[PDB]
Amino acid sequence: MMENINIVIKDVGYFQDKPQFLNSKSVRQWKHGTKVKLTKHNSHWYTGVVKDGNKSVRGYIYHSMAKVTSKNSDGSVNATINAHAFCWDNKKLNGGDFINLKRGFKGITHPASDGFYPLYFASRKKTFYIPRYMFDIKK
Numbered sequence: 001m002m003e004n005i006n007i008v009i010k011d012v013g014y015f016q017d018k019p020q021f022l023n024s025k026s027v028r029q030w031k032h033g034t035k036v037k038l039t040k041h042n043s044h045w046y047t048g049v050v051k052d053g054n055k056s057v058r059g060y061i062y063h064s065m066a067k068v069t070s071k072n073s074d075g076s077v078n079a080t081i082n083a084h085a086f087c088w089d090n091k092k093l094n095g096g097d098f099i100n101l102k103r104g105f106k107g108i109t110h111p112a113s114d115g116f117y118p119l120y121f122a123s124r125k126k127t128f129y130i131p132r133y134m135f136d137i138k139k
């Protein structure tokens with residue numbers, strides 16, 4: 001028996017514990033419009049720091065999920081979170097073919113044991129994958 005899941009791409013940007021989407025934890029899932037301070041980490045990632053109680057925690061967020069509104073003197077930048085997700089044509093979640101899925105994108109996927117949820121795009125000829133943490137299942 002095959003099954004289908006109705007999913008909605010979350011209204012958040014992904015502040016991960018590493019500059020990678022695969023095998024990373026969310027330090028923050030900042031609602032769209034959240035104001036943050038960040039530093040450029042590499043060509044595609046920003047980094048910054050939050051407080052988990054008494055502990056400083058470093059996080060990484062993809063360049064397209066942070067709209068830079070001003071640059072500070074000290075090299076850091078002020079940005080507003082631009083919430084969106086990705087699906088990839090590979091289970092590395094790193095380059096290849098990927099689609100920017102707008103916040104609130106409604107999709108249908110299938111139960112995935114390995115946590116790479118399939119999205120068939122009609123207009124493309126192929127399967128893309130989205131990790132669990134980028135969407136909600138409507139109950």
Ligand SMILES: CC(=O)N[C@@H]1[C@@H](O)[C@H](O)[C@@H](CO)O[C@H]1O
Nearest residue numbers: 035036037038047048049050051
């Ligand atoms: C990513 C981000 O915005 N980090 C800031 C940090 O830079 C700042 O020192 C602190 C002040 O409370 O609050 C955190 O939210």
Ligand SMILES: CC(=O)N[C@@H]1[C@@H](O)[C@H](O)[C@@H](CO)O[C@H]1O
Nearest residue numbers: 019020044086093094095096098
């Ligand atoms: C959405 C996506 O996977 N983007 C990746 C980025 O994470 C990575 O830093 C870089 C490696 O050079 O290649 C980009 O294509």
